Amino acid sequence: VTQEAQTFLAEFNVRAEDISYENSLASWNYNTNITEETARKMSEAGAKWAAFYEEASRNASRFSLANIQDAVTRLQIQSLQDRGSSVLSPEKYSRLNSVMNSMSTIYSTGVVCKATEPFDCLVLEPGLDDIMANSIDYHERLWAWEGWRADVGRMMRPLYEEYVELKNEAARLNNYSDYGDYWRANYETDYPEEYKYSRDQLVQDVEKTFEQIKPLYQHLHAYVRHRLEQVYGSELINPTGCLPAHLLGDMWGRFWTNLYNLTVPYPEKPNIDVTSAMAQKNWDAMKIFKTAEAFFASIGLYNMTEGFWTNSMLTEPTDNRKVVCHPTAWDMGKNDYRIKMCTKVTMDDFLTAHHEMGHIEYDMAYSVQPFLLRNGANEGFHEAVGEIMSLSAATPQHLKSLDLLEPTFQEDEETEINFLLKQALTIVGTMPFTYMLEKWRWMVFNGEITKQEWTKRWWKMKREIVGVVEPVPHDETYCDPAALFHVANDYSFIRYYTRTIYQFQFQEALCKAANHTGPLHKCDITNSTAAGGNLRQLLELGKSKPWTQALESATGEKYMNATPLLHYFEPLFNWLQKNNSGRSIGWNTDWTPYSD
Amino acid sequence: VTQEAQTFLAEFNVRAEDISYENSLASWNYNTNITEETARKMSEAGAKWAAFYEEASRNASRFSLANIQDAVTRLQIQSLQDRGSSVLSPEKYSRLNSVMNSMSTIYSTGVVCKATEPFDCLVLEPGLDDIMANSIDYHERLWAWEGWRADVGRMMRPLYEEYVELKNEAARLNNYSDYGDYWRANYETDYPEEYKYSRDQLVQDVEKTFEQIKPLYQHLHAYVRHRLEQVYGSELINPTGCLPAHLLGDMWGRFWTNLYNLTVPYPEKPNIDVTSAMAQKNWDAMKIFKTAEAFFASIGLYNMTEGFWTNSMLTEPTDNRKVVCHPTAWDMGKNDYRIKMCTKVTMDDFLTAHHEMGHIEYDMAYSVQPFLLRNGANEGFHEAVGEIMSLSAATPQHLKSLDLLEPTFQEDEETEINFLLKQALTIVGTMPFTYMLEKWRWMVFNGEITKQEWTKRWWKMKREIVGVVEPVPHDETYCDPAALFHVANDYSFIRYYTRTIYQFQFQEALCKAANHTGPLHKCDITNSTAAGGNLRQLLELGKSKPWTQALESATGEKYMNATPLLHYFEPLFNWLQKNNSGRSIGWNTDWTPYSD
Amino acid sequence: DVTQEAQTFLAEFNVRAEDISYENSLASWNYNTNITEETARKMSEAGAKWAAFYEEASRNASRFSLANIQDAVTRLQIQSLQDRGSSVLSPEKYSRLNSVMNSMSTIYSTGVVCKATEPFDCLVLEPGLDDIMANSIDYHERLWAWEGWRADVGRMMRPLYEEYVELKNEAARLNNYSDYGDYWRANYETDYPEEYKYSRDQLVQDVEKTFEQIKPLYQHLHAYVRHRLEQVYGSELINPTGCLPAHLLGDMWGRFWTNLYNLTVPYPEKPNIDVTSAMAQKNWDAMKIFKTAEAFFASIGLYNMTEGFWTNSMLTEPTDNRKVVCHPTAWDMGKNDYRIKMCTKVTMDDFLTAHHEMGHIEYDMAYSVQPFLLRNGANEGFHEAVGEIMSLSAATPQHLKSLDLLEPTFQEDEETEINFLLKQALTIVGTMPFTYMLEKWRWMVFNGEITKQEWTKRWWKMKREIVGVVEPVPHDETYCDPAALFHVANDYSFIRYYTRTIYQFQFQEALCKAANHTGPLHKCDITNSTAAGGNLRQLLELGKSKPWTQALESATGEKYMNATPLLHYFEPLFNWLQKNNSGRSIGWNTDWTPYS
Ligand SMILES: *[C@@H]1O[C@H](CO[C@@H]2O[C@@H](C)[C@@H](O)[C@@H](O)[C@@H]2O)[C@@H](O[C@@H]2O[C@H](CO)[C@@H](O)[C@H](O)[C@H]2NC(C)=O)[C@H](O)[C@H]1NC(C)=O
Ligand SMILES: *[C@@H]1O[C@H](CO[C@@H]2O[C@@H](C)[C@@H](O)[C@@H](O)[C@@H]2O)[C@@H](O[C@@H]2O[C@H](CO)[C@@H](O)[C@H](O)[C@H]2NC(C)=O)[C@H](O)[C@H]1NC(C)=O
Ligand SMILES: *[C@@H]1O[C@H](CO[C@@H]2O[C@@H](C)[C@@H](O)[C@@H](O)[C@@H]2O)[C@@H](O[C@@H]2O[C@H](CO)[C@@H](O)[C@H](O)[C@H]2NC(C)=O)[C@H](O)[C@H]1NC(C)=O
Ligand SMILES: *[C@@H]1O[C@H](CO)[C@@H](O[C@@H]2O[C@H](CO)[C@@H](O)[C@H](O)[C@H]2NC(C)=O)[C@H](O)[C@H]1NC(C)=O
Ligand SMILES: *[C@@H]1O[C@H](CO)[C@@H](O[C@@H]2O[C@H](CO)[C@@H](O)[C@H](O)[C@H]2NC(C)=O)[C@H](O)[C@H]1NC(C)=O
Ligand SMILES: *[C@@H]1O[C@H](CO)[C@@H](O[C@@H]2O[C@H](CO)[C@@H](O)[C@H](O)[C@H]2NC(C)=O)[C@H](O)[C@H]1NC(C)=O
Ligand SMILES: *[C@@H]1O[C@H](CO)[C@@H](O)[C@H](O)[C@H]1NC(C)=O
Ligand SMILES: *[C@@H]1O[C@H](CO)[C@@H](O)[C@H](O)[C@H]1NC(C)=O
Ligand SMILES: *[C@@H]1O[C@H](CO)[C@@H](O)[C@H](O)[C@H]1NC(C)=O
Ligand SMILES: *[C@@H]1O[C@H](CO)[C@@H](O)[C@H](O)[C@H]1NC(C)=O
Structure with missing residues (x-):
């Protein structure tokens, strides 16, 4: 039983390395040399990977994990046993394909067109991305933002409702509950009892640590909201309400890094450029x-x-x-x-x-x-x-x-607060955004957000969780989540959250290993050798052992902990409390530009 | 002014001699004992020498060669009127020292690292080298060749371009058109008449003697080419095209000596042991x-x-x-x-x-x-x-x-052909490599090759003049000439070309003086006093007389003649004319290992 | 809100102003094609009707908060219109300036220098001194025209120039500008689109930043002409290591070196391209x-x-x-x-x-x-x-x-190419130090960095500093040599020529991109390139609607002035100038003058 599992695995791995090598190859030759043959030869090699991975996962399914003896074969034979989306029928599975592919090329080829003169039509990248990074024209930042949403986003909705159906469908067939359970399973370290972690306990620890992070953000939100008034005026920013998405520093407010120039603490100081x-x-x-x-x-x-x-x-x-x-x-x-x-x-x-x-x-x-x-x-x-x-x-x-x-x-405590702010804009400002985005997606796969509360429970969850309000109402002809590359390209998004928390659990375990005396933000791990040790011990593991075990062995803790992050930012936390003395540190959920 | 110049050389010859002797001392001490204190003292000595020769050089600049009657004191107050790198502003002198000082320490510290497992980094001092002298693995010889170029060759490229700019400025401050012109100042015997050699004449006559050697180079080329098809095989060697630069038996293909074992004509006979x-x-x-x-x-x-x-x-x-x-x-x-x-x-x-x-x-x-x-x-x-x-x-x-x-x-001929072959690898393989390296610097200092086509025109000459194609496509991010020590350490190269012609003009001269009759290659000048008398008269000269007079008084001819060499390699050729009857002397300058 | 009231005011201003200025262009076309006194009358009447309409309309627009205007376009118009210009000043100080300005302009037009021998005949600029300055090689005849243009006309300016700067500077301050140099520097100020801004300080820095990019080039062109002008005038009048005298440069100022081509022709036995x-x-x-x-x-x-x-x-x-x-x-x-x-x-x-x-x-x-x-x-x-x-x-x-x-x-052949490139340099590279230093001395005179007592004292220290040109005769504070130029006597900016000459090469490179022409940029024609011309259309159709920084981007790729395409253009001459400038110097001694 274990003999055949190692036999089959010993076969797979050989033809597998060789066939996905052909696929890394074909992909490279596409990305570096964009033409149409490379377009063909990339999907020609991808297809070979898909059908060899399809059949081999069916073969693998034959093996019962109860009758395997190696911790290491169980893990291999397990992961290969995920048919993922081949479990569904060839007609349905290719309807999911065309629907997914059409969402993709809709995104890639989108355009919003000006209103005068030659009716110049502008593409997300980089035209629209350029207006949303550098422009302060409220109404031009709106122009791009509501056009990307009412012309591409509109072209997403029906597709996405099928995508959600077929993805959820396939998912269930794999003994998961929704296509969000499918994604959560990436965090599942079931196997060692000391290190057992369920898909549920991912949702919980996500929100739990967000809450530990919520306060810092609300001072960053209250800060930015105030020097967003200085630029757009009291008519356009409710001092005490949610912030309009078009004014967040890119197309979605994923990140806030482009609002630095508008929200630099100590402007008369230089930078570390x-x-x-x-x-x-x-x-x-x-x-x-x-x-x-x-x-x-x-x-x-x-x-x-x-x-x-x-x-x-x-x-x-x-x-x-x-x-x-x-x-x-x-x-x-x-x-x-x-x-x-x-x-x-x-x-x-x-x-x-x-x-x-x-x-x-x-x-x-x-x-x-x-x-x-x-x-x-x-x-x-x-x-x-x-x-x-x-x-x-x-x-x-x-x-x-x-x-x-x-x-x-x-x-100078000035350039220290300058540096830390540009960091938080980037690194903090995305954590409500990334949490709420993937939440919505979970709750839609859940069905908690029925198909007739999508644009309602999205923008509600935007206002309540992220501090961010729509400047123009949207009905259910929009699909605002599929306005963003990852939603429409079948990509998980919670990772960018869990990147953030983990990297400060790492940075602190590593800067402890090198006698670091003081502010985390002034830590450099170079010449450590000792830190690099712990660092090598994890990295050489890949997925050989549960994520819990390697987080503990390198840092000391078996679980996602947002405290180290909060260390990395304390000086700035203290600073926003002290700057935002007369502002409320929160948001309304009843003011919108429209209601103003 | 003869009298004074003489009085000034009087002061210098005594002061100079004493100071560069301390240098020779310091530098020797570094080479017999490589520690920190020796390298430092070596550098301190090089300082006093370098400063002393500048002021000296500056004072001789005061003088005026055509108001000096004695060719001897003319000659001396001439070579003393040359500085280089010193004529440059006090700030640009350092920029040139650092530029070269990092170039030269880049080449010494150079490694290349594998991926097979413990990523092992290998220097070129005792390793990457061994891989090029003793190897038959196309791929590993590619591994070191390409890698040596794409770690170091690239790491030289923005440093060669600066050196080239700052060095041409010095050559031009020294009233030389460019740093190539500077370097060919050696051969200028333009002072004594009847023996005037102009610098550009070296360019022409290097080429004109090169052509005499093309027919011996090309047969030697077309023979090894066939010896290499029997080692690496027909889909790695184009039987009518250039030879891949990495299969040639050292890092650069400079000498073909380590290729004897592959190329030896009579491997069943015995060698001189x-x-x-x-x-x-x-x-x-x-x-x-x-x-x-x-x-x-x-x-x-x-x-x-x-x-x-x-x-x-x-x-x-x-x-x-x-x-x-x-x-x-x-x-x-x-x-x-x-x-x-x-x-x-x-x-x-x-x-x-x-x-x-x-x-x-x-x-x-x-x-x-x-x-x-x-x-x-x-x-x-x-x-x-x-x-x-x-x-x-x-x-x-x-x-x-x-x-x-x-x-x-x-x-018997079998041993005299194995002997002559091996030699020709050492001595004939490198005449093209050398004419073409120095051409390419000459046309870069001159300006004929521009920074946009530095390596396009490098590899194009490697093909036409040298019969040698690259195994990997290289762009303008590399500086393949500086992958070689002489280039990165600011050393003129044609000397190895002029040497190989001279040594044979000399040796026929002395085999005549020794009444040696027959093959030049079987000549011995031992117990030959007529030979030594000739050679002592030439040797005392030093640089006191034009190198033309010198070469004339000892060999009769006063210019370079490639034909004593064609005489020493005459048995070999006649062998390579018959052995290559079925081959095609020549090489296509189009086919590459990467064009299908 | 004020946008709407401002659009009504515009439309009522544009009708009547198109109407009046047409009359103003008519009157003055009729003047420059027919110079009677009636045509002077009508040209003044028309100019004054316009002047009245502009006083009268910039007042009406002063009461228009620019921040309360929503359209960038409809704001930019109201901004321009809001400059009273010199109309701010009193009725007494406006007529003062105008009369100060006319008598400067008339001194310039009518100025003569007379000979000193027989009937003492007097010479004018257009068909007189200009020719001596553009054909002569008789040193002391050129000295006559250059030195008589500065002690007759030049000194007839000085008091008028001091008056004019004090008057033009009040206007400046009353219009919210710090001196008149600032008022001028306004043209380059674009700051409506926040991605595409520019300030009047940035001009000064970037003119200086690019001038340094060009100095090495202009130096070798300077150092080549000087050697040529020795060849003619000999060694005692043209110092090999020193500034060219000022009356030997092609026209009355050396604004352009073009007419020295006959004296500095690189290869004078080739067929000319006139x-x-x-x-x-x-x-x-x-x-x-x-x-x-x-x-x-x-x-x-x-x-x-x-x-x-x-x-x-x-x-x-x-x-x-x-x-x-x-x-x-x-x-x-x-x-x-x-x-x-x-x-x-x-x-x-x-x-x-x-x-x-x-x-x-x-x-x-x-x-x-x-x-x-x-x-x-x-x-x-x-x-x-x-x-x-x-x-x-x-x-x-x-x-x-x-x-x-x-x-x-x-x-x-490359000889007519280097012949052609040199004449281009003599017109183009010659003039950029000329323009910069001059504008630099105007800007600093308005600043106050150059007091009245140092006008001329500083002027020639800047000639010796930035342009490598010295005065053959000492001057003093009874001169105003700068006002011997037409643009200085007629209140015309000058930095335009320096900026024009930088733009034209960002332009030419961008359009030869579109034109599918590779090679030296000097050899690019764009005829029959509907493509090149279409890019030029979409630039040209803008006028002033959008900022220049943004125009330059949409046409060349870049937003700021860039000396580089101009460096590429002349790059061949610049390598040739280095070779043919060997036993020479790249610079000038500021201390030596032909009288000291
Ligand atoms: C990693 O490589 C270094 C050498 O590569 C470097 O390359 C340059 C970018 C520059 O940083 C140079 O200083 C370096 O040389 C290895 O260190 C060298 O190792 C060789 C062989 O082991 C040894 O002969 C040299 O003396 C070493 N160089 C110095 C300056 O001491 C190092 O061991 C490599 N480490 C790993 C993990 O691969
Ligand atoms: C060179 O030295 C020899 C003697 O030294 C040699 O040393 C050894 C290498 C050995 O193998 C032999 O060649 C010699 O021992 C000089 O020759 C001798 O000179 C003395 C005195 O003039 C004479 O009496 C001896 O007979 C000589 N010996 C021989 C073997 O001839 C020779 O003069 C030296 N050459 C020069 C140029 O100084
Ligand atoms: C500009 O005018 C040309 C015609 O120019 C005349 O002929 C040329 C040879 C040249 O010498 C000019 O100076 C002459 O005045 C227009 O070309 C004509 O276009 C019409 C319609 O496009 C067509 O029927 C004719 O055949 C064309 N004439 C020729 C000779 O081909 C051209 O379109 C004009 N360009 C503009 C308006 O932008
Ligand atoms: C090689 O060089 C080192 C350093 O130049 C020599 O060591 C020095 O020896 C002297 C006298 O023996 C000491 O006073 C110094 O302190 C030593 N310096 C160092 C750095 O150790 C060493 O003697 C040399 N080796 C040989 C064989 O000559
Ligand atoms: C070059 O010539 C100058 C002038 O004759 C020499 O200058 C003197 O050198 C002596 C000894 O080195 C010093 O004591 C004097 O102070 C120097 N005087 C001046 C005016 O320079 C110089 O030494 C000569 N250099 C060489 C290398 O010969
Ligand atoms: C060519 O072949 C000979 C024998 O096959 C090699 O000779 C050895 O060389 C090393 C170092 O030069 C000596 O230490 C050995 O003693 C030699 N072996 C014998 C049997 O004499 C030689 O290395 C080969 N050359 C190359 C470039 O591989
Ligand atoms: C890029 O792809 C095209 C067509 O697929 C091909 O002709 C070209 O040579 C390729 N260039 C590369 C791989 O550098
Ligand atoms: C020139 O002006 C005079 C007087 O203003 C007028 O009488 C004459 O006809 C004009 N000539 C032309 C060609 O305009
Ligand atoms: C300025 O305002 C006056 C007063 O109403 C008006 O008569 C005149 O036409 C205006 N001038 C303009 C708009 O140029
Ligand atoms: C450079 O040296 C040569 C050799 O005498 C001379 O002919 C030439 O004129 C020199 N050039 C300069 C500019 O001094």
């Missing part, structure tokens, strides 16, 4: 990577494979070749670590480079585990591992190490 | 350096000094201290001649013991000349002098005479 | 010039010329018909009236001028569709910049050969 110094010194892309390399190399982490320095696209491919420049790390496989990035000589990219080289390390580290176990402990682990590198690299003492800053930079 | 003959003759490093001086005194010349015996490092001083084991012959100045060498009992180091002592004798003959003229008649001479030596030493006449070859050793 | 002869043979009039220019615009996609253009425009000096302003200008008369004023000849310079002055007409006819108060180039330089990219493509020997102006057998 090294792009200046970086470049003064003829600096190039490699130097960014090769310094990222010596960071990890300093921690006793893995240098970069030769395949890495050849087969990566680290810079934009000069001319005549189109590229999905979004930074990405590919565990291509068969020992093929590559990074995709149209790198520039900027501080953002410098930290982005650290972040992406982190994902590789993780991929190299757990290269040792068998093919089916070579992924992060759970979904939000990869991301946390990545970002903690940016946490250390961005510090001023590390930037004084690399000569990218003169010993003149004063740690 | 005086090694084990030296082994059972209880030989030691001393006995080698003693049979070498005993050579140098049968050419009627001088034995070694007492300083050579006690100051030289001839046997590796164990590992109790660390040493630069590259074999160098040091003319330390103030009458002090040393050789640094990690001599073992290898037929090869027995040859390099003759070759390096050759340098010393040349050093000693011209010791009678004034300090600023105590150097070889041009760069090419000195590295040739020592070669005409090892040419004689290893010819089985000379070996039998040392009782190191059987009293009845037979010289 | 097409003046070929047109002479082919029997061209100006109508052929203007029709080939038209067709050029036609060829790119831009419009042909209106009837009103051909029948109204004076393109030829009136034969037997009164006096005329010859200087090429291009009149956007109003009411869809486009014309050109010019005294064209059959000479290439006018041929190019016909492309660059039909370019303002193309710009005009394009933004015609804009509102009246928005019918201008997005800043000073844009307008001149459009024309100068028309002359670029017109001036290439390739575009010249196509018109049969060059022989079909015109060897376009």
